[PDB]
Amino acid sequence: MLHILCQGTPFEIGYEHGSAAKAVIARSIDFAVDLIRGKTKKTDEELKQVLSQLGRVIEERWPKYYEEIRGIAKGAERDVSEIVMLNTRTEFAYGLKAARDCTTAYCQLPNGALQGQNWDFFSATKENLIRLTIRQAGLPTIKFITEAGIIGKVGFNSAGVAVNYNALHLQGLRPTGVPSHIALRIALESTSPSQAYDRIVEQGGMAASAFIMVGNGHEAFGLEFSPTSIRKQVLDANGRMVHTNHCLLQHGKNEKELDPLPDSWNRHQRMEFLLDGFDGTKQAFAQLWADEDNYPFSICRAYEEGKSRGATLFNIIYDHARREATVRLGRPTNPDEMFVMRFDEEDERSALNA
Ligand SMILES: CC1(C)S[C@@H]2[C@H](N)C(=O)N2[C@H]1C(=O)O
Structure with a gap:
């Protein structure tokens, strides 16, 4: 996958991304x-x-x-x-549509938390997936997977903050609110999940609806949001958090979920079942994301014309213990590519402003 190293001023950072991609x-x-x-x-x-x-x-x-x-x-x-x-x-x-008319998990574990997702979308975007390493003096170095051109998506930083993103369709739009991908970038520039939470909230309201998970080795939270609702998901009694594409939290009376996919319920129930028999190992954790129960609408989603419009386009697994992210491009049943992202001492020097 195209990997671009961006450093310097915000403009220089954008320019390297734009030129190389x-x-x-x-x-x-x-x-x-x-x-x-x-x-x-x-x-x-x-x-x-x-x-x-x-x-x-x-x-x-x-x-x-x-x-x-x-x-x-x-x-x-x-x-x-x-x-x-x-x-x-x-x-x-x-x-525009209103005018006219993913599976994610975090597991707290004894030898280190594990966090990951499958990103499911239209297959056309898979060839547009790139990764950026962004160094900004005095801020964490960020390594994230994105569609070329977009400044915030799914990844982690040298401070150990790991982010995941799930589509969610609560009703409402506030054009002056914070866009979801800007909130993702804000989280990726934070030194802890707590700071990430604080800084997203600082914006004073979301532009639309999505779900964002932020975690490190110690703590994690999910946010289900609309322009009129920010609800926090926390670890359950098993130290686990699972999210798909529908609201798991109770939102206000005025909140309205719009046409979520039926399989969103199926996949959540399935992942929770799978995590019950999960032995804790990184090998078994990686295999969860290749699950094909209820194919093609499975955790490892397949494109099948006339049934499912999208597929799993990538999987990411955050090994919090080691600060390594393993990325599998395409469907985890048979990945197009696999690689591990990790921060070197130069990444760390930029973060310290040294
Ligand atoms: C095209 C998608 C893969 S994108 C949306 C959500 N990630 C999910 O599942 N879907 C599928 C859908 O809307 O059919």
């Missing part, structure tokens, strides 16, 4: 444009203006992230609004 970003934009057009009757000109409005929000509220977005645009030779689109894709898509 130029052709991949073009594919990301193409795919996003197709997806977006499927959700709306609006003309492209109107869509451009909405994106200009969203860009102005990011510029005002998170100038550091906007500067990076500007760098990505410059390096990829694309319009800033196109990159803004990539970084607000879910929110943008949700909003």
Whole structure:
């Protein structure tokens, strides 16, 4: 998988990403444009203006992230609004559709916690998956898997903070709220899960709906959110946390979950069952993500035309004890690629600002 090392100012960071992933970003934009057009009757000109409005929000509220977005645009030779689109894709898509009309686990264990997910989506995006190592002086070094062009997704940092992301569809949109991928980046720049929690909350409200898990070797929490609800998931009596694509927590009376997939319930029940017979070993933990019960709608999801629109596109396993993330591209039953991410002393020097 394309691996880009980004360092320096926010703009320089964005620029390296944009330059080195130029052709991949073009594919990301193409795919996003197709997806977006499927959700709306609006003309492209109107869509451009909405994106200009969203860009102005990011510029005002998170100038550091906007500067990076500007760098990505410059390096990829694309319009800033196109990159803004990539970084607000879910929110943008949700909003347009309203106008018109993943399996994750954390296990606390004696020889170190284990945390992981499968990311399930349209297969077209798998070829657009890249990884970035981002060094910013005085902040944790981040290593994360993302679709080319997007500044926050799934990964971990030199401080041991590991993040996971699940689609969730509670109703509501706040265009001035924090986009999900910005919140992911905020979590990835934090030195602990507690700080991550604090800094996400600091934003004063989410733009839309998703689920985010943040953990290290000691503690972990999940967040189920809408623009009007932030509910915290904690470890159960077994030191476990499981999440799929539906609300497990009680939200306010006004909250409304929109068309979650039936298999989201099946997969959660399945993973909890699997973790019951789980012996604690890293080998067995890795095998959980290859489960094919209820195929093609399984934990290891398969694309099957006329049944399931997506597949598991990657799996990540955080070995908290060793601060290593094992990544398997494609379906864990037969991965396209497998590699281990780890921080070296240079990554650590940047984090210390030494
Ligand atoms: C296309 C997807 C793989 S993406 C969404 C969620 N991750 C899930 O499961 N789905 C599938 C769906 O919406 O059919």
